[PDB]
Scaffold this active site. Structure first.
Site, PDB file in Angstrom:
ATOM      1  CG  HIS A   9      -0.240   0.107   2.523  1.00 47.20           C
ATOM      2  ND1 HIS A   9       0.174   1.309   3.057  1.00 47.20           N
ATOM      3  CD2 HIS A   9       0.119  -0.844   3.416  1.00 47.20           C
ATOM      4  CE1 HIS A   9       0.759   1.092   4.222  1.00 47.20           C
ATOM      5  NE2 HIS A   9       0.739  -0.206   4.463  1.00 47.20           N
ATOM      6  CD  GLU A  82       3.242  -4.947   8.654  1.00 51.98           C
ATOM      7  OE1 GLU A  82       3.784  -4.113   7.896  1.00 51.98           O
ATOM      8  OE2 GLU A  82       3.618  -6.135   8.733  1.00 51.98           O
TER       9      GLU A  82
END
Ligand SMILES: [Cl-]
Ligand SMILES: [Cl-]
Ligand SMILES: [Cl-]
EC number: 3.1.3.73
Lengths: 203, 203
Positions: A9, A82
Protein backbone atom coordinates in the site's frame (compact mmCIF):
# COMPACT_ATOMS: atom_id res chain seq x y z
CA UNK A 1 0.96 -21.60 -13.77
CA UNK A 2 0.19 -19.04 -11.05
CA UNK A 3 1.66 -15.53 -10.97
CA UNK A 4 1.32 -13.43 -7.81
CA UNK A 5 1.56 -9.67 -8.41
CA UNK A 6 2.69 -8.21 -5.08
CA UNK A 7 1.66 -4.66 -4.14
CA UNK A 8 2.42 -2.77 -0.94
CA UNK A 9 0.00 0.00 0.00
CA UNK A 10 0.96 3.62 -0.54
CA UNK A 11 2.65 6.04 1.81
CA UNK A 12 0.58 6.69 4.94
CA UNK A 13 0.58 9.45 7.54
CA UNK A 14 2.13 7.00 10.01
CA UNK A 15 5.05 6.63 7.59
CA UNK A 16 5.61 10.40 7.50
CA UNK A 17 5.51 10.51 11.32
CA UNK A 18 7.72 7.42 11.66
CA UNK A 19 5.25 5.51 13.84
CA UNK A 20 4.58 1.80 14.13
CA UNK A 21 1.85 0.75 11.68
CA UNK A 22 -0.02 -2.43 12.55
CA UNK A 23 -3.78 -2.94 12.75
CA UNK A 24 -4.33 0.71 13.71
CA UNK A 25 -5.93 2.90 11.02
CA UNK A 26 -3.86 5.47 9.14
CA UNK A 27 -4.82 7.17 5.86
CA UNK A 28 -2.93 7.34 2.59
CA UNK A 29 -1.12 10.62 2.07
CA UNK A 30 -1.42 12.59 -1.16
CA UNK A 31 1.76 10.90 -2.38
CA UNK A 32 0.54 7.46 -1.32
CA UNK A 33 -2.67 8.03 -3.27
CA UNK A 34 -0.77 9.08 -6.40
CA UNK A 35 1.48 6.03 -6.01
CA UNK A 36 -1.57 3.77 -6.30
CA UNK A 37 -2.87 5.85 -9.21
CA UNK A 38 0.46 5.44 -11.03
CA UNK A 39 0.30 1.69 -10.35
CA UNK A 40 -3.13 1.65 -12.00
CA UNK A 41 -1.39 2.97 -15.11
CA UNK A 42 1.63 0.64 -14.88
CA UNK A 43 -0.51 -2.50 -14.44
CA UNK A 44 -3.38 -1.32 -16.68
CA UNK A 45 -2.58 -3.97 -19.29
CA UNK A 46 -2.58 -6.91 -16.85
CA UNK A 47 -5.78 -8.99 -16.77
CA UNK A 48 -6.00 -10.08 -13.15
CA UNK A 49 -8.27 -12.99 -12.26
CA UNK A 50 -8.56 -12.11 -8.55
CA UNK A 51 -7.64 -9.45 -5.97
CA UNK A 52 -6.38 -10.50 -2.53
CA UNK A 53 -6.34 -7.64 -0.03
CA UNK A 54 -5.73 -7.01 3.65
CA UNK A 55 -8.48 -6.08 6.10
CA UNK A 56 -6.85 -2.69 6.69
CA UNK A 57 -8.41 0.33 4.99
CA UNK A 58 -5.16 1.77 3.62
CA UNK A 59 -4.67 -1.50 1.74
CA UNK A 60 -8.24 -1.61 0.39
CA UNK A 61 -7.95 2.06 -0.58
CA UNK A 62 -4.84 1.23 -2.62
CA UNK A 63 -6.56 -1.72 -4.29
CA UNK A 64 -9.49 0.49 -5.29
CA UNK A 65 -7.15 3.06 -6.83
CA UNK A 66 -5.23 0.49 -8.89
CA UNK A 67 -8.57 -0.80 -10.24
CA UNK A 68 -10.47 2.44 -10.88
CA UNK A 69 -11.31 1.71 -14.53
CA UNK A 70 -12.15 -1.91 -13.79
CA UNK A 71 -14.40 -4.16 -11.72
CA UNK A 72 -13.17 -7.43 -10.22
CA UNK A 73 -14.08 -9.64 -7.24
CA UNK A 74 -11.92 -8.53 -4.31
CA UNK A 75 -11.33 -10.99 -1.47
CA UNK A 76 -10.44 -9.74 2.01
CA UNK A 77 -7.95 -11.95 3.88
CA UNK A 78 -6.94 -11.31 7.52
CA UNK A 79 -3.74 -13.33 7.04
CA UNK A 80 -2.54 -10.48 4.80
CA UNK A 81 -2.77 -7.98 7.67
CA UNK A 82 0.41 -6.40 8.99
CA UNK A 83 1.84 -7.66 12.27
CA UNK A 84 -0.15 -6.45 15.28
CA UNK A 85 2.02 -4.29 17.54
CA UNK A 86 -0.46 -4.06 20.42
CA UNK A 87 0.27 -1.18 22.77
CA UNK A 88 3.04 0.08 20.44
CA UNK A 89 0.67 0.97 17.58
CA UNK A 90 1.11 4.48 16.15
CA UNK A 91 4.03 5.21 18.49
CA UNK A 92 7.59 6.30 17.79
CA UNK A 93 10.76 4.34 18.49
CA UNK A 94 12.29 7.17 20.53
CA UNK A 95 9.26 7.35 22.83
CA UNK A 96 9.01 3.58 23.27
CA UNK A 97 12.54 3.31 24.66
CA UNK A 98 11.53 5.76 27.42
CA UNK A 99 7.92 4.68 28.06
CA UNK A 100 8.36 0.89 27.73
CA UNK A 101 12.11 0.33 28.00
CA UNK A 102 12.01 -3.16 29.52
CA UNK A 103 9.89 -4.81 26.82
CA UNK A 104 10.93 -2.64 23.87
CA UNK A 105 14.66 -3.22 24.37
CA UNK A 106 14.07 -6.98 24.51
CA UNK A 107 12.21 -6.58 21.21
CA UNK A 108 15.16 -4.66 19.74
CA UNK A 109 17.64 -7.37 20.77
CA UNK A 110 15.57 -10.48 19.89
CA UNK A 111 12.68 -9.52 17.60
CA UNK A 112 12.24 -13.15 16.49
CA UNK A 113 11.07 -14.23 19.96
CA UNK A 114 10.25 -11.12 22.01
CA UNK A 115 6.54 -10.25 21.81
CA UNK A 116 5.41 -6.60 21.57
CA UNK A 117 3.43 -5.54 24.63
CA UNK A 118 -0.11 -6.93 24.24
CA UNK A 119 0.65 -7.51 20.56
CA UNK A 120 1.64 -10.24 18.10
CA UNK A 121 5.07 -11.82 18.24
CA UNK A 122 7.10 -12.81 15.21
CA UNK A 123 6.49 -16.55 15.69
CA UNK A 124 2.70 -16.14 15.66
CA UNK A 125 2.95 -13.64 12.79
CA UNK A 126 5.09 -15.99 10.70
CA UNK A 127 2.59 -18.78 11.39
CA UNK A 128 -0.22 -16.56 10.11
CA UNK A 129 1.63 -15.77 6.88
CA UNK A 130 2.43 -19.49 6.63
CA UNK A 131 -1.31 -20.17 6.88
CA UNK A 132 -1.84 -17.95 3.83
CA UNK A 133 0.86 -19.82 1.88
CA UNK A 134 -0.83 -23.17 2.54
CA UNK A 135 -4.10 -21.53 1.44
CA UNK A 136 -2.78 -20.57 -2.01
CA UNK A 137 -3.65 -24.00 -3.44
CA UNK A 138 -7.29 -22.88 -3.20
CA UNK A 139 -6.50 -20.44 -6.04
CA UNK A 140 -4.85 -22.99 -8.35
CA UNK A 141 -7.25 -22.09 -11.19
CA UNK A 142 -6.44 -18.36 -11.17
CA UNK A 143 -3.59 -17.31 -13.46
CA UNK A 144 -2.93 -13.70 -12.38
CA UNK A 145 -3.58 -12.78 -8.74
CA UNK A 146 -3.07 -9.28 -7.34
CA UNK A 147 -1.98 -9.23 -3.69
CA UNK A 148 -2.29 -5.91 -1.82
CA UNK A 149 -0.67 -6.06 1.61
CA UNK A 150 2.13 -4.72 3.81
CA UNK A 151 5.92 -4.91 3.73
CA UNK A 152 6.29 -7.29 6.67
CA UNK A 153 3.86 -9.72 5.06
CA UNK A 154 5.14 -9.45 1.48
CA UNK A 155 8.81 -9.74 2.45
CA UNK A 156 8.00 -12.82 4.55
CA UNK A 157 5.84 -14.24 1.75
CA UNK A 158 8.75 -14.00 -0.71
CA UNK A 159 11.21 -15.55 1.75
CA UNK A 160 9.06 -18.58 2.54
CA UNK A 161 7.77 -19.16 -1.00
CA UNK A 162 11.30 -19.78 -2.31
CA UNK A 163 12.38 -21.82 0.71
CA UNK A 164 14.15 -19.49 3.14
CA UNK A 165 13.50 -19.33 6.89
CA UNK A 166 11.12 -16.66 8.14
CA UNK A 167 14.02 -14.74 9.70
CA UNK A 168 15.47 -14.10 6.23
CA UNK A 169 12.52 -11.85 5.30
CA UNK A 170 14.74 -8.77 5.63
CA UNK A 171 16.88 -9.89 2.69
CA UNK A 172 13.92 -8.62 0.62
CA UNK A 173 12.48 -5.13 1.04
CA UNK A 174 9.40 -4.22 -1.00
CA UNK A 175 8.84 -0.51 -1.56
CA UNK A 176 5.80 1.72 -1.95
CA UNK A 177 4.80 2.76 -5.45
CA UNK A 178 6.42 -0.35 -6.96
CA UNK A 179 5.18 -3.81 -7.90
CA UNK A 180 6.70 -7.27 -7.58
CA UNK A 181 5.91 -10.63 -9.14
CA UNK A 182 6.55 -14.26 -8.19
CA UNK A 183 5.71 -17.30 -10.33
CA UNK A 184 4.70 -20.68 -8.92
CA UNK A 185 4.86 -23.72 -11.22
CA UNK A 186 4.60 -27.21 -9.70
CA UNK A 187 5.15 -25.79 -6.18
CA UNK A 188 8.44 -24.17 -7.28
CA UNK A 189 8.43 -20.41 -6.67
CA UNK A 190 10.56 -18.11 -8.83
CA UNK A 191 11.05 -14.44 -8.01
CA UNK A 192 10.60 -12.75 -11.40
CA UNK A 193 10.29 -9.04 -10.51
CA UNK A 194 11.09 -7.10 -7.34
CA UNK A 195 10.21 -3.41 -6.88
CA UNK A 196 9.56 -2.37 -10.47
CA UNK A 197 8.29 1.04 -11.57
CA UNK A 198 7.90 -0.09 -15.20
CA UNK A 199 4.91 -1.30 -17.21
CA UNK A 200 3.97 -4.86 -16.29
CA UNK A 201 3.23 -7.48 -18.95
CA UNK A 202 1.41 -10.79 -18.61
CA UNK A 203 3.44 -13.99 -18.94
CA UNK B 1 27.13 1.05 1.97
CA UNK B 2 27.79 -0.83 -1.28
CA UNK B 3 25.24 -1.13 -4.10
CA UNK B 4 25.94 -3.64 -6.87
CA UNK B 5 23.98 -2.74 -10.01
CA UNK B 6 23.65 -6.05 -11.87
CA UNK B 7 23.35 -6.19 -15.67
CA UNK B 8 23.12 -9.29 -17.85
CA UNK B 9 24.40 -8.80 -21.39
CA UNK B 10 21.92 -8.40 -24.21
CA UNK B 11 20.49 -10.92 -26.64
CA UNK B 12 23.07 -12.77 -28.73
CA UNK B 13 22.95 -14.92 -31.86
CA UNK B 14 23.48 -17.94 -29.61
CA UNK B 15 20.26 -16.95 -27.83
CA UNK B 16 18.45 -16.73 -31.18
CA UNK B 17 19.57 -20.26 -32.05
CA UNK B 18 18.99 -21.63 -28.54
CA UNK B 19 22.56 -22.84 -28.05
CA UNK B 20 24.62 -23.33 -24.90
CA UNK B 21 26.59 -20.09 -24.52
CA UNK B 22 29.51 -20.04 -22.10
CA UNK B 23 33.07 -18.98 -22.92
CA UNK B 24 32.66 -19.14 -26.70
CA UNK B 25 32.39 -15.82 -28.57
CA UNK B 26 28.95 -14.84 -29.83
CA UNK B 27 28.00 -11.29 -30.84
CA UNK B 28 25.21 -9.09 -29.61
CA UNK B 29 22.36 -8.90 -32.09
CA UNK B 30 20.79 -5.62 -33.18
CA UNK B 31 18.19 -6.22 -30.46
CA UNK B 32 20.82 -6.97 -27.82
CA UNK B 33 22.58 -3.74 -28.78
CA UNK B 34 19.31 -1.81 -28.44
CA UNK B 35 18.80 -3.37 -25.00
CA UNK B 36 22.13 -1.97 -23.81
CA UNK B 37 21.30 1.43 -25.32
CA UNK B 38 17.97 1.53 -23.48
CA UNK B 39 19.73 0.53 -20.25
CA UNK B 40 22.03 3.51 -20.83
CA UNK B 41 18.90 5.69 -20.76
CA UNK B 42 17.52 3.98 -17.64
CA UNK B 43 20.77 4.36 -15.66
CA UNK B 44 21.80 7.77 -17.04
CA UNK B 45 21.53 9.45 -13.64
CA UNK B 46 23.40 6.80 -11.64
CA UNK B 47 26.94 7.86 -10.69
CA UNK B 48 28.93 4.67 -11.12
CA UNK B 49 32.46 4.78 -9.73
CA UNK B 50 33.35 1.25 -10.88
CA UNK B 51 32.31 -1.25 -13.55
CA UNK B 52 32.99 -4.98 -13.18
CA UNK B 53 32.83 -7.06 -16.33
CA UNK B 54 33.54 -10.58 -17.53
CA UNK B 55 36.16 -11.46 -20.13
CA UNK B 56 33.52 -12.15 -22.80
CA UNK B 57 33.50 -9.41 -25.43
CA UNK B 58 29.69 -9.46 -25.51
CA UNK B 59 29.63 -8.32 -21.87
CA UNK B 60 32.28 -5.65 -22.44
CA UNK B 61 30.31 -4.52 -25.49
CA UNK B 62 27.25 -4.11 -23.26
CA UNK B 63 29.16 -2.15 -20.61
CA UNK B 64 30.48 0.29 -23.22
CA UNK B 65 26.95 0.93 -24.50
CA UNK B 66 25.47 1.42 -21.02
CA UNK B 67 28.19 4.00 -20.30
CA UNK B 68 28.58 5.65 -23.72
CA UNK B 69 28.69 9.16 -22.24
CA UNK B 70 30.79 8.39 -19.17
CA UNK B 71 34.48 7.51 -18.99
CA UNK B 72 35.15 4.73 -16.49
CA UNK B 73 37.82 2.01 -16.77
CA UNK B 74 36.29 -1.45 -17.08
CA UNK B 75 37.77 -4.03 -14.72
CA UNK B 76 37.89 -7.46 -16.40
CA UNK B 77 37.08 -10.23 -13.90
CA UNK B 78 37.32 -13.82 -15.24
CA UNK B 79 35.33 -15.00 -12.21
CA UNK B 80 32.33 -13.22 -13.78
CA UNK B 81 32.53 -15.47 -16.86
CA UNK B 82 29.62 -17.76 -17.68
CA UNK B 83 30.01 -21.45 -16.86
CA UNK B 84 32.38 -23.19 -19.26
CA UNK B 85 30.47 -25.82 -21.25
CA UNK B 86 33.54 -27.40 -22.86
CA UNK B 87 32.66 -29.40 -25.96
CA UNK B 88 28.98 -28.46 -25.53
CA UNK B 89 29.61 -24.79 -26.33
CA UNK B 90 27.51 -23.36 -29.17
CA UNK B 91 25.47 -26.56 -29.53
CA UNK B 92 21.78 -27.32 -29.09
CA UNK B 93 19.99 -29.47 -26.52
CA UNK B 94 18.25 -31.35 -29.35
CA UNK B 95 21.60 -32.30 -30.91
CA UNK B 96 23.50 -32.96 -27.67
CA UNK B 97 20.97 -35.61 -26.62
CA UNK B 98 22.01 -37.73 -29.63
CA UNK B 99 25.73 -37.04 -30.15
CA UNK B 100 26.77 -37.12 -26.46
CA UNK B 101 23.90 -39.13 -25.01
CA UNK B 102 25.45 -40.71 -21.91
CA UNK B 103 27.20 -37.58 -20.62
CA UNK B 104 24.42 -35.15 -21.54
CA UNK B 105 21.68 -37.33 -20.05
CA UNK B 106 23.60 -37.44 -16.76
CA UNK B 107 23.95 -33.65 -16.89
CA UNK B 108 20.20 -33.20 -17.42
CA UNK B 109 19.37 -35.35 -14.37
CA UNK B 110 22.25 -34.62 -11.95
CA UNK B 111 23.30 -31.13 -13.07
CA UNK B 112 24.87 -30.30 -9.68
CA UNK B 113 27.47 -33.09 -9.93
CA UNK B 114 27.71 -34.17 -13.59
CA UNK B 115 30.50 -32.47 -15.54
CA UNK B 116 29.88 -31.22 -19.10
CA UNK B 117 32.27 -32.99 -21.46
CA UNK B 118 35.68 -31.33 -21.07
CA UNK B 119 33.90 -28.42 -19.37
CA UNK B 120 33.59 -27.08 -15.84
CA UNK B 121 31.04 -28.52 -13.44
CA UNK B 122 28.64 -26.70 -11.16
CA UNK B 123 30.86 -27.32 -8.12
CA UNK B 124 33.88 -25.59 -9.66
CA UNK B 125 31.58 -22.92 -11.11
CA UNK B 126 30.03 -22.17 -7.72
CA UNK B 127 33.44 -22.04 -6.03
CA UNK B 128 34.58 -19.62 -8.74
CA UNK B 129 31.65 -17.27 -8.11
CA UNK B 130 32.29 -17.73 -4.38
CA UNK B 131 35.86 -16.55 -5.00
CA UNK B 132 34.43 -13.36 -6.52
CA UNK B 133 32.24 -12.81 -3.45
CA UNK B 134 35.29 -13.19 -1.19
CA UNK B 135 37.22 -10.32 -2.82
CA UNK B 136 34.26 -7.91 -2.83
CA UNK B 137 35.93 -6.26 0.18
CA UNK B 138 38.59 -4.94 -2.20
CA UNK B 139 35.90 -2.54 -3.48
CA UNK B 140 34.90 -1.35 0.00
CA UNK B 141 35.48 2.31 -0.92
CA UNK B 142 33.24 2.25 -4.01
CA UNK B 143 29.53 2.93 -3.64
CA UNK B 144 27.85 2.30 -7.04
CA UNK B 145 29.34 -0.69 -8.87
CA UNK B 146 28.04 -1.77 -12.28
CA UNK B 147 28.38 -5.54 -12.74
CA UNK B 148 28.02 -6.72 -16.35
CA UNK B 149 27.96 -10.52 -16.48
CA UNK B 150 25.83 -13.54 -17.42
CA UNK B 151 22.69 -15.21 -16.12
CA UNK B 152 24.37 -18.15 -14.39
CA UNK B 153 26.76 -15.86 -12.51
CA UNK B 154 24.24 -13.18 -11.54
CA UNK B 155 21.61 -15.67 -10.34
CA UNK B 156 24.22 -17.55 -8.31
CA UNK B 157 25.60 -14.26 -6.95
CA UNK B 158 22.21 -13.14 -5.60
CA UNK B 159 21.49 -16.53 -4.03
CA UNK B 160 24.86 -16.73 -2.26
CA UNK B 161 24.91 -13.09 -1.15
CA UNK B 162 21.68 -13.44 0.85
CA UNK B 163 22.88 -16.74 2.34
CA UNK B 164 21.21 -19.39 0.22
CA UNK B 165 22.83 -22.57 -1.13
CA UNK B 166 24.29 -22.42 -4.62
CA UNK B 167 21.63 -24.76 -6.05
CA UNK B 168 18.92 -22.22 -5.18
CA UNK B 169 20.29 -19.95 -7.93
CA UNK B 170 17.22 -20.72 -10.06
CA UNK B 171 14.82 -19.10 -7.60
CA UNK B 172 16.06 -15.91 -9.30
CA UNK B 173 16.26 -15.50 -13.06
CA UNK B 174 17.96 -12.35 -14.34
CA UNK B 175 16.38 -11.25 -17.62
CA UNK B 176 17.95 -9.44 -20.56
CA UNK B 177 17.24 -5.75 -21.06
CA UNK B 178 16.67 -5.15 -17.33
CA UNK B 179 18.73 -4.15 -14.30
CA UNK B 180 18.85 -5.37 -10.72
CA UNK B 181 20.40 -3.99 -7.55
CA UNK B 182 21.60 -5.54 -4.29
CA UNK B 183 22.82 -3.45 -1.35
CA UNK B 184 25.48 -4.66 1.09
CA UNK B 185 25.64 -2.99 4.51
CA UNK B 186 27.98 -4.46 7.13
CA UNK B 187 28.20 -7.85 5.37
CA UNK B 188 24.38 -8.09 5.12
CA UNK B 189 23.05 -8.27 1.56
CA UNK B 190 19.67 -6.79 0.60
CA UNK B 191 17.97 -7.45 -2.74
CA UNK B 192 16.40 -4.09 -3.60
CA UNK B 193 15.48 -4.46 -7.30
CA UNK B 194 15.18 -7.49 -9.59
CA UNK B 195 14.76 -7.12 -13.37
CA UNK B 196 13.47 -3.56 -13.59
CA UNK B 197 12.79 -1.72 -16.84
CA UNK B 198 12.33 1.65 -15.10
CA UNK B 199 14.54 4.64 -14.37
CA UNK B 200 17.12 3.91 -11.67
CA UNK B 201 18.13 6.38 -8.96
CA UNK B 202 20.96 5.83 -6.50
CA UNK B 203 20.57 5.61 -2.73
CL1 LIG C 1 -5.59 1.74 7.74
CL1 LIG D 1 23.06 -16.06 -22.75
CL1 LIG E 1 31.35 -12.89 -26.66
Amino acid sequence: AMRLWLIRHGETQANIDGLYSGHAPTPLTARGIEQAQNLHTLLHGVSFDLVLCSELERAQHTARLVLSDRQLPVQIIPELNEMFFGDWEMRHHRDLMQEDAENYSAWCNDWQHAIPTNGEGFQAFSQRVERFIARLSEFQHYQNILVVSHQGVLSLLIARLIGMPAEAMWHFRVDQGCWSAIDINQKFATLRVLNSRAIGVEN
